[PDB]
């Protein structure tokens, strides 16, 4: 079997297979989605668990129409990992991150073992480093040409780069935002959008808290937001929790004034996906070249 | 059993487990074919004056083009049978608006016709994926689909909202029963049309009078504008103009902002990537544009 050394997150030299058959990954949305993706699924992940018992991959059926009810795929635990089960199904590879509580040197005793850290560079260095780790460049060269189409389709749609955009959330009485709002942030900034200098000028990666009398700093031509809705929840949440941030919001910007305050579903927005950025790019197009309002 | 009828009546002995398909259209056999996870080796395609060719929408919709992959371009017009045969192919797939008569390709492998007429997008892929052997990657597929449909459905009463699809077409408005891509997840996702459209039969379209529009009033109206050609969606704005000046009036869903337009590409695939597309746009357009 060829056989190749991949330096982990952990700067451990592992000695793992060029083309692994049976891994099992630690995490459903870090790494179980993107494994999904490059075609290569692990046989056992991490999952949640609902109160009756029920087990699923997180996002899995939503971005990718994976779940554990669907596929051969073994759940092998939400907290605390079945170590029986990891072993009963016969890995050539284990991938884990930083955040999950099995021990490195358990999981190393059973099969080649990496520890991937998406704090190193993100979601783009996530998926070059999975497909160096399982040989599925050749698919990663796909996703990454689907991608570039999509960003090219949103820039011939409009002039993007004279367009102002912010991403915002309520956050406990104020507005927090980030650098770059996951895939929708991620979405925007390639496609040229130009973002206050507020959010511009926080380090990349970071994000910060601002006052609700600072509205106004955070207003642009369009002002996305996100609302949850993995668990019952609709869009006329994050406007009340907007309303509970300060009533009136609306007009202090510009943009919930003129209609052109814009809400989208957090789940996929979160994702490190492929999957994810498409959903985006559309939504984008459509929400800012395709709403004409009186 | 490695025995296929297609959509010509046709008993054909075909391979179990193909491994190198040409595909004779890029829309209704290629995108298809992409997503199930068989690519064929060969493939019907697009050309530019300038003589480049392309697989239509293969680089939006699944990331693959010939540009960036071992598939050959076999042709756009005529096909080109001397490539097909180089390609070396177990199946051939064809479809009946192509002109290569079919005991040509015969001669060089076993060959199926697939008739999107019959059934479309659905009929099409469950065809392909038993020709292929491709049932589980279909059934991942279709489990997608499902959890996109309860994600808007859960997102919204769709049950109490209308929505309407319009094309300018020529000086009318031309309706469908189910507009592709964008009408069968507004179908799915359980929202109710104007009266004029649940009559129209199955797989049918019309034409109506420009003067008609109020008929085909909605919460909601979408419609199609064509990017692939350096087209914006102001320019569908100017269209309908030209059909009826100050149409917007004579829609309610237009004076109050809520005419939404969708790239048509898109809107128009038979594919899985589409109906996904089609689900996020009608969730945030619907429910996540609230206006003063
Ligand atoms: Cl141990
Ligand atoms: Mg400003």
């Given at each position: 079997?060829?056989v190749?050394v991949?330096?982990?997150?952990?700067?451990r030299?592992?000695?793992?297979?060029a083309?692994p058959?049976r891994?099992?990954s630690?995490?459903?949305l870090?790494?179980?989605?993107p494994?999904?993706?490059?075609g290569v699924?692990?046989?056992?992940?991490?999952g949640?668990?609902?109160?009756?018992?029920?087990h699923?991959?997180?996002?899995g059926?939503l971005?990718?129409?994976?779940?554990?009810?669907?596929?051969?795929?073994?759940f092998i635990?939400?907290?605390?990992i079945d170590?029986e089960?990891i072993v009963?199904?016969?890995?050539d590879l284990?991938?884990?991150e930083?955040?999950?509580?099995?021990?490195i040197?358990r999981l190393?005793?059973?099969?080649?073992?990496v520890?991937?850290?998406?704090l190193?560079?993100?979601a783009p260095?996530?998926?070059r480093?999975?497909?160096?780790l399982?040989?599925?460049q050749?698919?990663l060269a796909?996703?990454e040409?689907?991608?570039?189409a999509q960003?090219?389709?949103l820039?011939?749609?409009?002039?993007s780069?004279?367009?102002?955009?912010?991403?915002?959330q309520?956050?406990?009485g104020?507005?927090?935002?980030?650098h770059?709002?996951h895939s929708?942030?991620?979405v925007?900034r390639?496609?040229?959008f130009?973002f206050p200098?507020?959010?511009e000028?926080i380090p990349?990666g970071?994000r910060?808290?601002?006052?609700?009398?600072?509205?106004?700093?955070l207003?642009a031509?369009?002002?996305?937001?996100?609302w949850?809705?993995?668990?019952?929840?609709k869009?006329?949440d994050?406007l009340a929790?907007?309303?509970?941030?300060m009533p009136?919001?609306?007009?202090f910007?510009?943009?919930?004034?003129?209609g052109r305050?814009?809400?989208?579903?957090?789940?996929?927005?979160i994702s490190?996906?492929f999957?994810?950025?498409?959903?985006?790019?559309?939504?984008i197009?459509?929400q800012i070249a395709?709403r004409p309002?009186?």
């Amino acid at each position: 079997e060829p056989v190749q050394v991949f330096t982990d997150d952990l700067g451990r030299k592992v000695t793992v297979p060029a083309h692994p058959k049976r891994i099992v990954s630690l995490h459903d949305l870090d790494i179980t989605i993107p494994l999904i993706e490059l075609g290569v699924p692990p046989v056992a992940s991490h999952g949640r668990t609902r109160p009756d018992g029920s087990h699923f991959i997180r996002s899995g059926a939503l971005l990718t129409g994976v779940d554990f009810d669907n596929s051969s795929i073994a759940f092998i635990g939400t907290a605390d990992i079945d170590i029986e089960a990891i072993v009963a199904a016969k890995p050539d590879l284990i991938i884990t991150e930083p955040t999950r509580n099995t021990p490195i040197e358990r999981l190393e005793k059973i099969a080649p073992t990496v520890s991937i850290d998406h704090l190193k560079g993100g979601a783009p260095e996530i998926y070059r480093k999975l497909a160096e780790l399982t040989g599925t460049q050749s698919q990663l060269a796909i996703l990454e040409r689907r991608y570039q189409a999509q960003i090219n389709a949103l820039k011939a749609t409009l002039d993007s780069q004279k367009i102002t955009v912010s991403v915002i959330q309520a956050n406990q009485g104020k507005i927090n935002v980030m650098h770059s709002y996951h895939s929708l942030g991620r979405v925007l900034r390639d496609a040229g959008f130009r973002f206050p200098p507020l959010i511009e000028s926080i380090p990349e990666g970071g994000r910060m808290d601002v006052s609700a009398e600072r509205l106004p700093e955070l207003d642009a031509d369009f002002v996305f937001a996100t609302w949850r809705g993995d668990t019952g929840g609709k869009p006329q949440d994050e406007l009340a929790t907007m309303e509970k941030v300060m009533p009136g919001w609306c007009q202090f910007l510009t943009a919930c004034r003129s209609g052109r305050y814009v809400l989208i579903s957090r789940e996929e927005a979160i994702s490190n996906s492929f999957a994810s950025l498409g959903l985006m790019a559309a939504q984008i197009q459509s929400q800012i070249a395709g709403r004409p309002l009186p």
